[PDB]
Design a protein around this ligand. Sequence first.
Ligand SMILES: [Zn+2]
Lengths: 195, 100, 54, 64
Amino acid sequence: AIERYFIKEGVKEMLIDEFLEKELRRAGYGGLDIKKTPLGTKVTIFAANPGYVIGRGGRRIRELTRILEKQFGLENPQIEVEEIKNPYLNAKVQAVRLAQALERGIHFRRAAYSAIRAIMRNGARGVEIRLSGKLTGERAKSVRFYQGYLAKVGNPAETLVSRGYAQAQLKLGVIGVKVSIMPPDAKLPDEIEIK
Amino acid sequence: QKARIKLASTNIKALNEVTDQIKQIAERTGVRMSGPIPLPTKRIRITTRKSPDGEGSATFDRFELRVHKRLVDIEADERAMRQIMRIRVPEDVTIEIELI
Amino acid sequence: KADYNKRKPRKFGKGARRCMRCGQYGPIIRIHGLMLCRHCFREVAPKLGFKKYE
Amino acid sequence: GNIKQTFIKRTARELFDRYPDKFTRDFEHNKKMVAELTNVTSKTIRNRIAGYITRLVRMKEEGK
RNA sequence: UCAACGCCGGGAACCUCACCGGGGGCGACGGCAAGGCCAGGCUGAAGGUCUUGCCGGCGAGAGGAGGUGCAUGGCCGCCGUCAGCUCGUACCGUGAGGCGUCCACUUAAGUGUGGUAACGAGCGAGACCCGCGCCCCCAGUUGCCAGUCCUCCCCGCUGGGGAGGAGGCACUCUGGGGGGACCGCCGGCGAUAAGCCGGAGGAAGGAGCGGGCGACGGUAGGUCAGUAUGCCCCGAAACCCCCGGGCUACACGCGCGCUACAAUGGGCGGGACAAUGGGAUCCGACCCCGAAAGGGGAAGGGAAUCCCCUAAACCCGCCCUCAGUUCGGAUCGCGGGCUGCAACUCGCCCGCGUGAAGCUGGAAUCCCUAGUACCCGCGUGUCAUCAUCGCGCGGCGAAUACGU
Ligand SMILES: [Zn+2]
């Protein structure tokens, strides 16, 4: 009918988004957009380093559009590879970056402060970062860093702030990274200004 | 001859866009129109349980998907059909057309 | 030898359905064509376009 | 509770300490003035501000 | 214990499955043919195994509903939708730490007004989002039909009353935008402030009503048996399939509920009036078989078009007239059917018979402030069938207090 079509679109695009999330980790994966047309289905991939996606000597761009056919059955499609400018305001890329750092071996306080100042220097009214796990010895704990303004609860929590979550797999176990960012063009209902 | 267009979407702005566009294309030309006609809104509700285990009091999570619908009849004149099929519709809207 | 390794087909019951995301058996939403368990829907719902609204 | 908040009171005190020649001791007049002078997307807040300004002026005519 | 016990969406016939009995298959890659089939026997059955022939050219790991929730993540529950938690600078103190964040009045509120070794900010509150109720504008089909015109039908005492159809949107309704309520006006109290209380006005009054979002942290609280995940363990088994059993076993103790122990009622016959939601090998009107359960044709419908859908409690008339009964309705027997590969273990439904405890309940204890509780039934979730359950819907509709 109608609901069936909407929901099937949602489910298919979400499963694709997750597959790409996991199989394009290094490049940076910020989003996705599938457009339906009679000329075939277009699929645009957002990212920071399109080169990794491109695969200069091929072996990636055909892998991609032939797995989309083999498994998820997209109508004779092809893909565009865009790029994010000012990616320091999308929280998912930043969370994955921080997790990759932790896996490399950086100290969590070092890396967290690095990320916070890099997100400040580029435009942000507030940022909050949270880590959880076996940071210091066996007994797990949770740590929290913050700057600026935030809107934890209400409607603006949903509609203004950008959130992201990721996992880091270390020699011992798993560490959870949560990032939340408030862009510069965010205005609250209480912030009025007199003419 | 008449033509009837049905529009459905999760967004009211796209619907208003398409309505204004076809209304203006039909007005600038000479064609008697119909609508826009609002049909009732279709709500898909799903109430689930939050906890992934059994223990704990039962707190339930109610999700909702609202879908807004519109209807139009345009009278399918000589050039009206060919100039209306030449519309730039967003891909979050479902548009269908039927000739009566 | 290749026969005694893989399932009898099921057109009904409980082993007929399975979660698209994880692969669970018992609890599955079937409402309006969805095929997710009660756990994965609560995580992927704000992507599908659902809201609280209550 | 029928309490006025600090930022509401602050906005009203400012709009009454500057641009005073506009408001009077009636409510709808000051509603119009407030919506004329502010960037607002609500009505309860505007009415609250207008009534606070009404109070302010109706006892400023008396002083203390 | 609150915060386990109609909870794990846990209504398990096979599958689910993790348990019991038996049978059979799985070794990536790296180093010194594999595999397949007719006819029959072993076998619960089986090129699994052999009889008879023919076709083909030692180490690691996959995987795990196996342990560890006292190794983790994430998600939920409780203190708590409580009003609390912090920062910068200054000052007091050897220091841990304090002040601000205290006192008086006020508020649902660390919500606010005044005084002060403090002056100022943040995160929670409020703001924000959704819906109900009154008014206005646009709009008018798949929704509605008053007035208009044609037809057609029936009835007394000739005036009244219904169905089509054209044709309209007026009333109803649908869904977009906008207004309206703010302690604003009116007399006290307090302090001349903050606010509270009368009274007026007002579809509605005092955050209008009902909800959502739920902080810094704690609870070694629950979850490895939702997915993800470290260490150990099984790796030819604890992996992966099938075929039968069990989770439905019953001297008992408990939790939550259903049905009742009568007349503020049981039965038979006739009269009525809804809303929320859902529908592809799905909902099935209409007609025909059958006493009923049910069976054979089949229009329409991809959802304001058709169906599921003339709900029950309630009103009227007759029988029963305080009785283990015309209350009660368990338990058993013979019979007839549906869903399903398969209904004994162990499924739902029907018809006739049988007719068990129960006659208002100790000590104790639970839920509720208005369209609320009590009472009545209805979709939906699970679903090949099966609802004494969960989440919602309407119909009838109070009693008491405005406190401590
Ligand atoms: Zn799942």
